[PDB]
């Protein structure tokens, strides 16, 4: 029976700038969605989940809670304006006008989707034409591509030579924002957080600190989001400079590389 518990997380105390993507002012349109990369920081998702000003907070791969117990290598953040009736469209396995033509969320997307109303900040009297959406596109989009080209369309057998008219339309048109319409036409801010994991040292992790390690005892351990129970001892095996954890045959973790020291420890099942 285990006696103590040990945890070991990196020596980093840099707060992650999550407010820059949320609290900024000028945000791009849908078919030119911005992308931000996040790494080498510590983040607290409890305050993000407990905001009380969040119309839609839906996400997959991880539970809304418990998320402070995981470590990832990178974080990607995207943001765009979507009309009220089409917030549902930003979700895996959905077919629609904007998702299929402007930005399609991959099916295996392990991450979170946030959407909230900002009608008091972007609605303009007389028509806000600053935000625009692509309406007319020729081909479907594979996950995670950005299209910027605005070449004229040829929807018929007669080329228009770059002149709008019959069988030739401008793919880009204005939203037509007005605070006097119904709920469906109202805008909503949409932000997508993506996650990834590879065989490389973790960069962005969760809160809570580490403790001193012990050996030659049956102890419950948690190394960088990997939980187990056993006896930690000293061993000797080849470890490539970047590979983190190595496993013995039959998918049993045999050796782990301790962060903050680059030491190699061996796990033996206590009996």
């Amino acid at each position, epitope marked *: 029976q285990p006696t103590e518990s040990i945890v070991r997380f990196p*020596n*980093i105390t840099n707060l992650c700038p999550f407010g820059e993507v949320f609290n900024a002012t000028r945000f791009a349109s849908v078919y030119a969605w911005n992308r931000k990369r996040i790494s080498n920081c510590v983040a607290d998702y409890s305050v993000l989940y407990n905001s009380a000003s969040f119309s839609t907070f839906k996400c997959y791969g991880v539970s809304p809670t418990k998320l402070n117990d995981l470590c990832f290598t990178n974080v990607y953040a995207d943001s765009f304006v979507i009309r009220g009736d089409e917030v549902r469209q930003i979700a895996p396995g959905q077919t629609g006008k904007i998702a299929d033509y402007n930005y399609k969320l991959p099916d295996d997307f392990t991450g979170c989707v946030i959407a909230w109303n900002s009608n008091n900040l972007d609605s303009k009297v007389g028509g806000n034409y600053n935000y625009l959406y692509r309406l007319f596109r020729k081909s479907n989009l594979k996950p995670f591509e950005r299209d910027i080209s605005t070449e004229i369309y040829q929807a018929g057998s007669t080329p228009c030579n770059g002149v709008e008219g019959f069988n030739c339309y401008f793919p880009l048109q204005s939203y037509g924002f007005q605070p006097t319409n119904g709920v469906g036409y109202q805008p909503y801010r949409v932000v997508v957080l993506s996650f990834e994991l590879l065989h490389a*040292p973790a960069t962005v992790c969760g809160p809570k600190k580490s403790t001193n390690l012990v050996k030659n005892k049956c102890v419950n351990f948690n190394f960088n989001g990997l939980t187990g129970t056993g006896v930690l001892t000293e061993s000797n095996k*080849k470890f*490539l*400079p970047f590979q983190q954890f190595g496993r013995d045959i039959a998918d049993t973790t045999d050796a782990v590389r301790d962060p*903050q020291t*680059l030491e190699i420890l061996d796990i033996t099942p206590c009996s």
Partner: antibody
Framework: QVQLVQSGAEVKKPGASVKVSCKAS????????IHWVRQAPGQGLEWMGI????????SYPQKFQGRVTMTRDTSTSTVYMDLSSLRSEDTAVYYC??????????????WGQGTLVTVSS | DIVMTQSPDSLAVSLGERATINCKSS????????????LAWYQQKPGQPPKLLIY???ARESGVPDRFSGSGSGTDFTLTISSLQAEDVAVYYC?????????FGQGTKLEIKR
């Protein structure tokens, strides 16, 4: 061919930062690793980091964990060794080497010329 | 990490005689499934970056003469220079590459007896 060249010597007051560039030429820049070593005047060699192109770790020993920062660049094919919080015991010569022959291997074959860094008041 | 101890610290050898420098380790640095040691012997002259001289502990790079050799296994290794000339005065280091520490040696200067 298969050569690395660095910048010139620097002398700075304590508390400032240091940036050193290791320009590479001759091989495929994104197929080998690169390490940085330092040499105190009259002492033995040391080891202070590792980095690989195409994205990857920047691993340090215990005493260099929260001080050194080693960035990466492509196209220009350069590496950087941003170092902060200088002290009086940092006056040394810095070399940048690569791995060679892949796998788990060190073989620091093509050393650079190394730059001299002095910290004084 | 691995603590590598190299002795003797300094030595003086006449022209045309043997010379041996020993580099010990702290943990066994061989590897089953491959049977390959993991060591490297360098050489540094003043105002010059160190240049690789011996690798794998039993092989030499191209261009190095036959006067330099290398033998050993397990924990202790040796150089055994064959013939000493006037241009072989430098500082020698030993380094291992099986663990993250990348530990090296201490340095053994050479002189000429007279």
């Amino acid at each position: 061919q298969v050569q690395l060249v660095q910048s010139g010597a620097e002398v700075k007051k304590p508390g400032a930062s240091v940036k050193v560039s290791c320009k590479a030429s001759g091989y495929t820049f994104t197929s080998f690793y690169i390490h940085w070593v330092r040499q105190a005047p009259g002492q033995g060699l040391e080891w202070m980091g590792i980095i690989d192109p195409s994205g990857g770790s920047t691993s340090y020993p215990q005493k260099f964990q929260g001080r050194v920062t080693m960035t990466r660049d492509t196209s220009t094919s350069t590496v950087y060794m941003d170092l902060s919080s200088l002290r009086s015991e940092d006056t040394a010569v810095y070399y940048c080497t690569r791995d060679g022959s892949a796998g788990d291997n060190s073989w620091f074959d093509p050393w650079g010329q190394g730059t001299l860094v002095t910290v004084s008041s | 990490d691995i603590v590598m101890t190299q002795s003797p610290d300094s030595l003086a050898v006449s022209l045309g005689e043997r010379a041996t420098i020993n580099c010990k380790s702290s943990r066994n640095v061989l590897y089953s499934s491959n049977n390959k040691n993991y060591l490297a012997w360098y050489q540094q002259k003043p105002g010059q970056p160190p240049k690789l001289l011996i690798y794998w502990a039993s092989a030499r790079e191209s261009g190095v003469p036959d006067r330099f050799s290398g033998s050993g296994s397990g924990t202790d290794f040796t150089l055994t220079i064959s013939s000493l000339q006037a241009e072989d005065v430098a500082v020698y280091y030993c380094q291992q590459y099986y663990n993250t520490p990348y530990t090296f040696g201490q340095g053994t200067k050479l002189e000429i007896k007279r």
